[PDB]
């Protein structure tokens, strides 16, 4: 029971919602996204800098 | 400076020559308390018929003091004083003169002019919005937004 | 100070190279309503 | 500061200079109890035409005292006092004056502008509901409920 | 409270200052009897034009007494007192003042406002009842009764 | 030729012959100060209905003084003096005369004539500008701008 829409940017879909909580002419919009991460092997990457 | 209470009563007393240096009469302390009580009663009544004008009521439960500050702007002193003078003239069983009535009417009219607001009638709510406004879905722009019911969820039913 | 153009001024934008390089193949459509809040792979 | 009874009576007596704090000659307490009884009867009558303004009638059987709490808001003090003065002046063989009448009328109008309601007229109950309201066939939503 | 018949006469006498504490005058016994009799006659007459208000009359040999209950509510006291004062002032040959007249008419208007009933007209009796009322199974009325 | 607060009060007293520099009797100094306060309050009230007329109020904290400079142009002297006279005549238990009332009304009308402004109703905002005004040289001129917000 809330009107919404979907916006896509670089292959990421963003859910946008609209509602009018409060009767002081105060509209509200919100955007959501939920990612997930995983580290397979720590021994295959890291940091580096220069050496003298 | 600061428009204190009590001196507004002195204003009316002087203006009708109840107690002023012009008539050589001295102020009676028994009348000033009645004047201040009448002033507070008249302002309390004025809270509804005209709008609020910034009057500061006595905090707590105690009688007012004649030397406290009223808080009213200096542009309302004539109006307030003339109104309370008209309301307390009957105490001494005296009849006001036409010039005093005219001055009080003029001051009251100016005060009412100051705190004036005219409402504007907004759209009904079922009034269509023309095609030239380019309405769109996901927005309620198809029709004019009336007064929202503000009843949602389980508490409406 | 009254008429305003309908085109916004340009702004600043970062760049995207990190997301395009990491592995987005093994983990894709795996956290569903049945798997739960976590999923695991095997090791050699 | 509560607006107790008898304070209204004292105000009404003062505003016509019958008796006040500065009067050398004062009035007997029988007049004061008569005044509070008149105020009680006036409020009982006001329960009809102007409406209900939260007056606290005496309960049980004891007569109204000149010291009990009336419970009225402060804003109604001048209106009540002027009405009591108008209904009480004839007791002392006196006649009112135009300025007192104008003040009483203004105070009464200020009191009356709070109780205004302006009721709204609901639908007839046989008026059809527009088909664009998307009613339900079996829930009897094709017509307005009317009243009750 | 009980609002005895004696109280009403005393209120009217106190008004206009015929017998009151403020006037330093005491009430004569005969005036009380005359006032009670006039109140009885007035309330007997009021059974037709204003309507019934629940006043209690004596039984058999009347002999109404000031200590007898009246049965009136506290609201109608002012109206009854003012009407009695208007009908009784002619005994002492006194012309009423305009303020008393205004008070009396205002109280009487409030009293008549309290007991106002507006009759509602009904259908003739040969007026048809439309097909929308389902006069086959929902009702047997092809026409309104409309008379009672 | 600089109008002061105090000479306005003296003008009001003189015009109705209470103090006239030759009256063999003088008014107490307190009445002059009270007249100055009345003038200040009245001309502060005048900030709403008549409007600004270049009045210079007192210092941010100091009390007004009779010898203080007012800044009112000389053309407003009669009007302000008659208004003050009407506003404080009853202080001495008095009443005006028809000729004084007529003079005060004439002065007040003369004052109001100078400070009169008649606004002009601009276009609605959705009203269209016709093809008579070539609007192609501009990107957005096909309709009137409307009143500034």
Short mmCIF file of N, CA and C in Angstrom, two decimals, chain E:
data_model
loop_
_atom_site.label_atom_id
_atom_site.label_comp_id
_atom_site.label_asym_id
_atom_site.label_seq_id
_atom_site.Cartn_x
_atom_site.Cartn_y
_atom_site.Cartn_z
N UNK E 1 -33.03 22.64 44.62
CA UNK E 1 -33.59 21.66 45.54
C UNK E 1 -35.10 21.53 45.37
N UNK E 2 -35.83 21.59 46.48
CA UNK E 2 -37.28 21.41 46.43
C UNK E 2 -37.94 22.58 45.71
N UNK E 3 -37.44 23.80 45.92
CA UNK E 3 -37.97 25.01 45.29
C UNK E 3 -39.45 25.17 45.63
N UNK E 4 -39.70 25.42 46.91
CA UNK E 4 -41.05 25.54 47.42
C UNK E 4 -41.78 26.72 46.78
N UNK E 5 -43.11 26.72 46.94
CA UNK E 5 -43.91 27.80 46.39
C UNK E 5 -43.62 29.12 47.09
N UNK E 6 -43.18 29.07 48.35
CA UNK E 6 -42.83 30.29 49.05
C UNK E 6 -41.63 30.99 48.46
N UNK E 7 -40.66 30.21 47.96
CA UNK E 7 -39.44 30.80 47.43
C UNK E 7 -39.72 31.66 46.20
N UNK E 8 -40.63 31.22 45.34
CA UNK E 8 -40.89 31.93 44.09
C UNK E 8 -41.48 33.31 44.38
N UNK E 9 -42.43 33.38 45.32
CA UNK E 9 -43.04 34.67 45.65
C UNK E 9 -42.01 35.61 46.27
N UNK E 10 -41.15 35.08 47.13
CA UNK E 10 -40.12 35.91 47.75
C UNK E 10 -39.16 36.48 46.72
N UNK E 11 -38.83 35.70 45.69
CA UNK E 11 -37.95 36.20 44.64
C UNK E 11 -38.58 37.38 43.91
N UNK E 12 -39.86 37.24 43.54
CA UNK E 12 -40.55 38.32 42.84
C UNK E 12 -40.66 39.56 43.73
N UNK E 13 -40.95 39.37 45.01
CA UNK E 13 -41.04 40.50 45.92
C UNK E 13 -39.69 41.19 46.10
N UNK E 14 -38.61 40.40 46.20
CA UNK E 14 -37.28 40.99 46.31
C UNK E 14 -36.95 41.81 45.08
N UNK E 15 -37.23 41.27 43.90
CA UNK E 15 -37.10 42.06 42.69
C UNK E 15 -38.08 43.22 42.73
N UNK E 16 -37.65 44.36 42.20
CA UNK E 16 -38.36 45.64 42.22
C UNK E 16 -38.39 46.24 43.63
N UNK E 17 -37.80 45.56 44.62
CA UNK E 17 -37.58 46.10 45.96
C UNK E 17 -38.89 46.39 46.69
N UNK E 18 -39.79 45.40 46.71
CA UNK E 18 -41.01 45.54 47.51
C UNK E 18 -40.78 45.05 48.93
N UNK E 19 -40.03 43.95 49.09
CA UNK E 19 -39.72 43.42 50.41
C UNK E 19 -38.41 42.66 50.31
N UNK E 20 -37.32 43.27 50.78
CA UNK E 20 -36.00 42.67 50.67
C UNK E 20 -35.11 43.22 51.77
N UNK E 21 -33.99 42.53 51.99
CA UNK E 21 -33.04 42.97 53.01
C UNK E 21 -32.39 44.29 52.63
N UNK E 22 -32.08 44.47 51.34
CA UNK E 22 -31.44 45.71 50.90
C UNK E 22 -32.34 46.91 51.14
N UNK E 23 -33.65 46.73 50.99
CA UNK E 23 -34.60 47.82 51.21
C UNK E 23 -34.90 48.05 52.68
N UNK E 24 -34.36 47.22 53.58
CA UNK E 24 -34.64 47.31 55.01
C UNK E 24 -36.13 47.20 55.29
N UNK E 25 -36.81 46.36 54.51
CA UNK E 25 -38.25 46.16 54.63
C UNK E 25 -38.54 44.67 54.76
N UNK E 26 -39.47 44.34 55.66
CA UNK E 26 -39.90 42.97 55.87
C UNK E 26 -41.21 42.71 55.14
N UNK E 27 -41.46 41.44 54.85
CA UNK E 27 -42.62 41.06 54.05
C UNK E 27 -43.84 40.88 54.95
N UNK E 28 -44.97 41.43 54.51
CA UNK E 28 -46.22 41.25 55.24
C UNK E 28 -46.83 39.89 54.91
N UNK E 29 -47.49 39.24 55.88
CA UNK E 29 -48.07 37.92 55.60
C UNK E 29 -49.13 37.93 54.50
N UNK E 30 -49.92 39.00 54.39
CA UNK E 30 -51.02 39.00 53.43
C UNK E 30 -50.50 39.03 52.00
N UNK E 31 -49.43 39.79 51.75
CA UNK E 31 -48.86 39.83 50.41
C UNK E 31 -48.39 38.46 49.96
N UNK E 32 -47.87 37.65 50.89
CA UNK E 32 -47.44 36.30 50.55
C UNK E 32 -48.63 35.45 50.12
N UNK E 33 -49.75 35.55 50.84
CA UNK E 33 -50.94 34.79 50.46
C UNK E 33 -51.44 35.22 49.09
N UNK E 34 -51.48 36.52 48.83
CA UNK E 34 -51.91 37.00 47.52
C UNK E 34 -50.98 36.51 46.42
N UNK E 35 -49.67 36.56 46.66
CA UNK E 35 -48.73 36.08 45.67
C UNK E 35 -48.88 34.60 45.39
N UNK E 36 -49.08 33.79 46.43
CA UNK E 36 -49.26 32.36 46.24
C UNK E 36 -50.53 32.07 45.45
N UNK E 37 -51.62 32.77 45.77
CA UNK E 37 -52.86 32.57 45.03
C UNK E 37 -52.69 32.96 43.56
N UNK E 38 -52.02 34.09 43.31
CA UNK E 38 -51.80 34.52 41.93
C UNK E 38 -50.91 33.53 41.18
N UNK E 39 -49.90 32.98 41.85
CA UNK E 39 -49.06 31.96 41.23
C UNK E 39 -49.87 30.73 40.88
N UNK E 40 -50.75 30.30 41.79
CA UNK E 40 -51.59 29.14 41.53
C UNK E 40 -52.48 29.38 40.31
N UNK E 41 -53.12 30.55 40.26
CA UNK E 41 -54.00 30.85 39.13
C UNK E 41 -53.22 30.94 37.83
N UNK E 42 -52.05 31.58 37.85
CA UNK E 42 -51.24 31.70 36.65
C UNK E 42 -50.80 30.34 36.13
N UNK E 43 -50.36 29.46 37.03
CA UNK E 43 -49.90 28.15 36.59
C UNK E 43 -51.06 27.27 36.14
N UNK E 44 -52.25 27.48 36.70
CA UNK E 44 -53.43 26.79 36.18
C UNK E 44 -53.76 27.28 34.77
N UNK E 45 -53.60 28.58 34.52
CA UNK E 45 -53.87 29.12 33.19
C UNK E 45 -52.84 28.64 32.18
N UNK E 46 -51.58 28.50 32.60
CA UNK E 46 -50.49 28.13 31.71
C UNK E 46 -50.58 26.71 31.19
N UNK E 47 -51.66 25.98 31.49
CA UNK E 47 -51.79 24.61 31.03
C UNK E 47 -52.20 24.51 29.56
N UNK E 48 -52.48 25.63 28.90
CA UNK E 48 -53.01 25.63 27.54
C UNK E 48 -52.08 26.33 26.56
N UNK E 49 -51.67 27.56 26.86
CA UNK E 49 -50.88 28.30 25.88
C UNK E 49 -49.41 27.88 25.87
N UNK E 50 -48.68 27.92 27.01
CA UNK E 50 -47.28 27.49 26.97
C UNK E 50 -47.14 25.97 27.01
N UNK E 51 -48.03 25.31 27.73
CA UNK E 51 -48.01 23.87 27.88
C UNK E 51 -47.78 23.46 29.32
N UNK E 52 -47.73 22.14 29.52
CA UNK E 52 -47.51 21.57 30.84
C UNK E 52 -46.02 21.58 31.18
N UNK E 53 -45.71 21.93 32.43
CA UNK E 53 -44.33 22.00 32.88
C UNK E 53 -44.16 21.22 34.18
N UNK E 54 -45.13 20.38 34.51
CA UNK E 54 -45.00 19.51 35.66
C UNK E 54 -45.29 20.13 37.00
N UNK E 55 -45.92 21.30 37.03
CA UNK E 55 -46.28 21.93 38.30
C UNK E 55 -47.32 21.08 39.03
N UNK E 56 -47.22 21.06 40.36
CA UNK E 56 -48.08 20.24 41.20
C UNK E 56 -49.12 21.12 41.87
N UNK E 57 -50.39 20.79 41.67
CA UNK E 57 -51.50 21.51 42.26
C UNK E 57 -51.99 20.80 43.52
N UNK E 58 -52.68 21.55 44.37
CA UNK E 58 -53.23 20.98 45.58
C UNK E 58 -54.43 20.10 45.26
N UNK E 59 -54.85 19.31 46.25
CA UNK E 59 -55.91 18.33 46.09
C UNK E 59 -57.13 18.72 46.91
N UNK E 60 -58.30 18.61 46.30
CA UNK E 60 -59.54 18.93 47.00
C UNK E 60 -59.56 20.38 47.43
N UNK E 61 -59.76 20.61 48.73
CA UNK E 61 -59.62 21.95 49.28
C UNK E 61 -58.17 22.39 49.13
N UNK E 62 -57.92 23.33 48.22
CA UNK E 62 -56.56 23.67 47.84
C UNK E 62 -55.75 24.20 49.02
N UNK E 63 -56.11 25.38 49.51
CA UNK E 63 -55.35 26.12 50.51
C UNK E 63 -53.85 25.97 50.26
N UNK E 64 -53.33 26.50 49.15
CA UNK E 64 -51.89 26.40 48.91
C UNK E 64 -51.10 27.13 49.99
N UNK E 65 -49.95 26.57 50.34
CA UNK E 65 -49.13 27.12 51.41
C UNK E 65 -47.71 27.35 50.91
N UNK E 66 -47.02 28.35 51.45
CA UNK E 66 -45.65 28.63 51.00
C UNK E 66 -44.68 27.49 51.27
N UNK E 67 -45.00 26.58 52.18
CA UNK E 67 -44.12 25.47 52.50
C UNK E 67 -44.36 24.24 51.64
N UNK E 68 -45.26 24.32 50.67
CA UNK E 68 -45.56 23.19 49.81
C UNK E 68 -44.59 23.13 48.64
N UNK E 69 -44.25 21.91 48.23
CA UNK E 69 -43.36 21.73 47.09
C UNK E 69 -44.06 22.16 45.80
N UNK E 70 -43.26 22.54 44.81
CA UNK E 70 -43.76 23.00 43.52
C UNK E 70 -43.53 22.01 42.39
N UNK E 71 -42.41 21.29 42.41
CA UNK E 71 -42.11 20.33 41.37
C UNK E 71 -41.44 20.90 40.14
N UNK E 72 -41.24 22.21 40.07
CA UNK E 72 -40.57 22.82 38.94
C UNK E 72 -39.06 22.62 39.02
N UNK E 73 -38.40 22.45 37.87
CA UNK E 73 -36.94 22.43 37.87
C UNK E 73 -36.38 23.81 38.16
N UNK E 74 -35.10 23.84 38.56
CA UNK E 74 -34.45 25.10 38.91
C UNK E 74 -34.31 26.05 37.73
N UNK E 75 -34.45 25.56 36.49
CA UNK E 75 -34.23 26.42 35.33
C UNK E 75 -35.37 27.41 35.13
N UNK E 76 -36.61 27.00 35.41
CA UNK E 76 -37.77 27.83 35.09
C UNK E 76 -38.05 28.88 36.15
N UNK E 77 -37.24 28.94 37.21
CA UNK E 77 -37.51 29.83 38.33
C UNK E 77 -37.54 31.29 37.92
N UNK E 78 -36.55 31.72 37.13
CA UNK E 78 -36.47 33.13 36.74
C UNK E 78 -37.65 33.52 35.86
N UNK E 79 -38.01 32.67 34.91
CA UNK E 79 -39.14 32.96 34.03
C UNK E 79 -40.44 33.06 34.82
N UNK E 80 -40.66 32.09 35.72
CA UNK E 80 -41.89 32.11 36.52
C UNK E 80 -41.93 33.34 37.41
N UNK E 81 -40.79 33.68 38.02
CA UNK E 81 -40.75 34.85 38.89
C UNK E 81 -41.03 36.14 38.15
N UNK E 82 -40.44 36.30 36.96
CA UNK E 82 -40.68 37.52 36.19
C UNK E 82 -42.12 37.61 35.71
N UNK E 83 -42.70 36.49 35.27
CA UNK E 83 -44.11 36.53 34.87
C UNK E 83 -45.01 36.88 36.05
N UNK E 84 -44.73 36.31 37.22
CA UNK E 84 -45.51 36.64 38.41
C UNK E 84 -45.36 38.11 38.77
N UNK E 85 -44.14 38.64 38.68
CA UNK E 85 -43.93 40.05 38.99
C UNK E 85 -44.71 40.94 38.04
N UNK E 86 -44.70 40.61 36.75
CA UNK E 86 -45.47 41.38 35.78
C UNK E 86 -46.96 41.33 36.06
N UNK E 87 -47.49 40.16 36.43
CA UNK E 87 -48.92 40.04 36.71
C UNK E 87 -49.31 40.58 38.08
N UNK E 88 -48.34 40.83 38.97
CA UNK E 88 -48.63 41.25 40.33
C UNK E 88 -48.35 42.73 40.59
N UNK E 89 -47.51 43.38 39.78
CA UNK E 89 -47.17 44.78 40.04
C UNK E 89 -48.39 45.69 40.07
N UNK E 90 -49.47 45.31 39.38
CA UNK E 90 -50.66 46.16 39.36
C UNK E 90 -51.32 46.27 40.72
N UNK E 91 -51.04 45.34 41.64
CA UNK E 91 -51.62 45.42 42.98
C UNK E 91 -51.16 46.67 43.71
N UNK E 92 -49.88 47.02 43.59
CA UNK E 92 -49.31 48.17 44.26
C UNK E 92 -49.25 49.41 43.36
N UNK E 93 -49.80 49.33 42.15
CA UNK E 93 -49.83 50.45 41.21
C UNK E 93 -48.42 50.96 40.92
N UNK E 94 -47.62 50.09 40.32
CA UNK E 94 -46.24 50.39 39.96
C UNK E 94 -46.03 50.07 38.49
N UNK E 95 -45.44 51.00 37.75
CA UNK E 95 -45.18 50.81 36.33
C UNK E 95 -43.82 50.16 36.15
N UNK E 96 -43.73 49.01 35.47
CA UNK E 96 -42.44 48.33 35.33
C UNK E 96 -41.47 49.13 34.47
N UNK E 97 -40.19 49.00 34.81
CA UNK E 97 -39.10 49.65 34.09
C UNK E 97 -38.72 48.81 32.87
N UNK E 98 -38.15 49.44 31.83
CA UNK E 98 -37.80 48.68 30.62
C UNK E 98 -36.83 47.53 30.85
N UNK E 99 -35.89 47.67 31.79
CA UNK E 99 -34.92 46.60 32.02
C UNK E 99 -35.60 45.34 32.53
N UNK E 100 -36.56 45.49 33.45
CA UNK E 100 -37.30 44.34 33.95
C UNK E 100 -38.07 43.68 32.82
N UNK E 101 -38.67 44.49 31.94
CA UNK E 101 -39.40 43.93 30.81
C UNK E 101 -38.48 43.14 29.89
N UNK E 102 -37.29 43.67 29.61
CA UNK E 102 -36.35 42.96 28.75
C UNK E 102 -35.91 41.65 29.39
N UNK E 103 -35.61 41.67 30.69
CA UNK E 103 -35.22 40.45 31.38
C UNK E 103 -36.34 39.42 31.34
N UNK E 104 -37.57 39.85 31.59
CA UNK E 104 -38.70 38.93 31.60
C UNK E 104 -38.91 38.31 30.23
N UNK E 105 -38.85 39.12 29.17
CA UNK E 105 -39.10 38.58 27.84
C UNK E 105 -37.98 37.65 27.41
N UNK E 106 -36.73 37.96 27.79
CA UNK E 106 -35.62 37.07 27.47
C UNK E 106 -35.77 35.72 28.18
N UNK E 107 -36.13 35.75 29.46
CA UNK E 107 -36.32 34.50 30.19
C UNK E 107 -37.48 33.70 29.62
N UNK E 108 -38.57 34.37 29.25
CA UNK E 108 -39.71 33.67 28.66
C UNK E 108 -39.34 33.07 27.31
N UNK E 109 -38.54 33.78 26.52
CA UNK E 109 -38.09 33.23 25.25
C UNK E 109 -37.24 31.98 25.47
N UNK E 110 -36.36 32.01 26.47
CA UNK E 110 -35.58 30.81 26.79
C UNK E 110 -36.48 29.66 27.21
N UNK E 111 -37.48 29.95 28.04
CA UNK E 111 -38.40 28.90 28.50
C UNK E 111 -39.15 28.28 27.33
N UNK E 112 -39.64 29.11 26.41
CA UNK E 112 -40.36 28.57 25.26
C UNK E 112 -39.42 27.85 24.30
N UNK E 113 -38.15 28.27 24.25
CA UNK E 113 -37.16 27.55 23.47
C UNK E 113 -36.95 26.14 24.01
N UNK E 114 -36.95 26.00 25.34
CA UNK E 114 -36.67 24.70 25.93
C UNK E 114 -37.71 23.66 25.54
N UNK E 115 -38.99 24.04 25.52
CA UNK E 115 -40.08 23.10 25.31
C UNK E 115 -40.66 23.16 23.90
N UNK E 116 -39.85 23.51 22.91
CA UNK E 116 -40.34 23.63 21.54
C UNK E 116 -40.28 22.29 20.82
N UNK E 117 -41.39 21.91 20.20
CA UNK E 117 -41.46 20.72 19.35
C UNK E 117 -42.04 21.14 18.01
N UNK E 118 -41.40 20.70 16.93
CA UNK E 118 -41.80 21.04 15.57
C UNK E 118 -42.43 19.80 14.94
N UNK E 119 -43.74 19.81 14.68
CA UNK E 119 -44.36 18.63 14.06
C UNK E 119 -43.84 18.40 12.66
N UNK E 120 -43.81 17.13 12.27
CA UNK E 120 -43.34 16.71 10.96
C UNK E 120 -44.53 16.20 10.15
N UNK E 121 -44.71 16.74 8.95
CA UNK E 121 -45.81 16.32 8.10
C UNK E 121 -45.59 14.90 7.59
N UNK E 122 -46.69 14.23 7.27
CA UNK E 122 -46.66 12.86 6.78
C UNK E 122 -47.39 12.77 5.44
N UNK E 123 -47.14 11.68 4.73
CA UNK E 123 -47.74 11.50 3.41
C UNK E 123 -49.26 11.40 3.52
N UNK E 124 -49.93 11.68 2.40
CA UNK E 124 -51.38 11.85 2.42
C UNK E 124 -52.09 10.57 2.84
N UNK E 125 -51.73 9.44 2.22
CA UNK E 125 -52.42 8.20 2.50
C UNK E 125 -52.80 7.47 1.23
N UNK E 126 -53.08 8.22 0.17
CA UNK E 126 -53.23 7.68 -1.17
C UNK E 126 -51.99 7.90 -2.02
N UNK E 127 -50.91 8.38 -1.41
CA UNK E 127 -49.67 8.59 -2.14
C UNK E 127 -49.07 7.24 -2.53
N UNK E 128 -48.66 7.06 -3.78
CA UNK E 128 -48.10 5.77 -4.19
C UNK E 128 -46.74 5.52 -3.55
N UNK E 129 -46.40 4.25 -3.42
CA UNK E 129 -45.07 3.81 -3.03
C UNK E 129 -44.41 3.18 -4.25
N UNK E 130 -43.24 3.67 -4.61
CA UNK E 130 -42.62 3.28 -5.86
C UNK E 130 -42.22 1.82 -5.90
N UNK E 131 -41.87 1.37 -7.11
CA UNK E 131 -41.43 -0.01 -7.30
C UNK E 131 -40.09 -0.28 -6.65
N UNK E 132 -39.31 0.76 -6.34
CA UNK E 132 -38.02 0.56 -5.72
C UNK E 132 -38.08 0.08 -4.28
N UNK E 133 -39.23 0.25 -3.63
CA UNK E 133 -39.39 -0.21 -2.26
C UNK E 133 -39.70 -1.70 -2.16
N UNK E 134 -39.89 -2.38 -3.29
CA UNK E 134 -40.18 -3.81 -3.32
C UNK E 134 -41.43 -4.14 -2.50
N UNK E 135 -42.56 -3.60 -2.94
CA UNK E 135 -43.82 -3.81 -2.24
C UNK E 135 -44.45 -5.17 -2.54
N UNK E 136 -43.68 -6.12 -3.05
CA UNK E 136 -44.16 -7.48 -3.24
C UNK E 136 -43.83 -8.37 -2.05
N UNK E 137 -42.56 -8.41 -1.63
CA UNK E 137 -42.11 -9.29 -0.57
C UNK E 137 -41.52 -8.52 0.60
N UNK E 138 -40.96 -7.33 0.35
CA UNK E 138 -40.36 -6.57 1.44
C UNK E 138 -41.43 -5.88 2.29
N UNK E 139 -42.50 -5.41 1.65
CA UNK E 139 -43.60 -4.72 2.32
C UNK E 139 -44.88 -5.01 1.54
N UNK E 140 -46.03 -4.86 2.21
CA UNK E 140 -47.32 -5.05 1.56
C UNK E 140 -47.95 -3.71 1.16
N UNK E 141 -47.27 -2.61 1.45
CA UNK E 141 -47.81 -1.27 1.24
C UNK E 141 -47.64 -0.86 -0.22
N UNK E 142 -48.75 -0.83 -0.96
CA UNK E 142 -48.76 -0.12 -2.23
C UNK E 142 -48.89 1.38 -2.05
N UNK E 143 -49.36 1.83 -0.89
CA UNK E 143 -49.53 3.25 -0.60
C UNK E 143 -49.18 3.49 0.86
N UNK E 144 -48.81 4.72 1.17
CA UNK E 144 -48.45 5.07 2.54
C UNK E 144 -49.70 5.05 3.42
N UNK E 145 -49.60 4.59 4.67
CA UNK E 145 -50.71 4.80 5.62
C UNK E 145 -50.88 6.28 5.93
N UNK E 146 -49.78 6.91 6.34
CA UNK E 146 -49.66 8.36 6.40
C UNK E 146 -50.69 9.15 7.19
N UNK E 147 -51.52 8.48 7.98
CA UNK E 147 -52.50 9.20 8.78
C UNK E 147 -52.36 8.94 10.27
N UNK E 148 -52.16 7.68 10.67
CA UNK E 148 -52.08 7.29 12.08
C UNK E 148 -53.35 7.68 12.84
#
